[PDB]
Design a protein around this ligand. Structure first.
Ligand SMILES: [Cl-]
Ligand SMILES: [Mn+2]
Length: 172
């Protein structure tokens, strides 16, 4: 009787269509991504956000920026850390493979770093990935690994697994 679980259960119970069920599956994958981020930020004593506009990040680190003379792409990374000298752009991932990591890594690089270079904010793209089966944590970003060499998260993706399995069983 978690509310998140009960609400997915109810939709899986209700769904008749493979088409509508695709949306439930994506929402489960999203909720799983967000649970990892929430837990990861608690373990690291860093502020949890999910999807902050790049414009909002620039204004927090440098409120005096003359924002009007930059083309700021309207991307929403998962989170960020501003140390006072470097900006760490964070994305969370829950996956067994690398591909989603490499896709996002390149997306964030193409879209964030150039305007940040124009502004003069030292920025680095970091991705943290949880394997939902083994609970192994893979990190990309040299400075993140320096700031957080130990990550004491305790994770449990079983509820997410059970929900997805029930969908897959409904639509063999
Ligand atoms: Cl994910
Ligand atoms: Mn995201």
């Amino acid at each position: 009787e978690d509310p998140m679980y009960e609400q997915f259960l109810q939709r899986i119970q209700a769904v008749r269509t493979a088409t509508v069920a695709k949306d439930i599956s994506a929402d489960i994958l999203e909720a799983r991504h967000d649970y990892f981020g929430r837990e990861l930020c608690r373990a690291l004593d860093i502020e949890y956000r999910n999807n902050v506009l790049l414009d909002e990040i620039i204004l927090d680190v440098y409120p005096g920026v003359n924002l009007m003379e930059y083309n700021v792409p309207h991307v929403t990374p998962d989170n960020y850390i501003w140390t006072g000298d470097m900006l760490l752009i964070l994305a969370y991932k829950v996956s067994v493979g690398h591909d989603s990591t490499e896709v996002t890594y390149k997306k964030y690089t193409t879209l964030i770093l150039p305007v940040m270079q124009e502004i003069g904010i030292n920025t680095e793209i970091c991705i943290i990935r949880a394997n939902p089966v083994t609970n192994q944590i893979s990190i990309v970003g040299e400075q993140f690994k320096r700031l957080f060499p130990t990550i004491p998260v305790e994770l449990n993706f079983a509820r997410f697994f059970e929900l997805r399995k029930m969908l897959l069983d409904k639509f063999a």
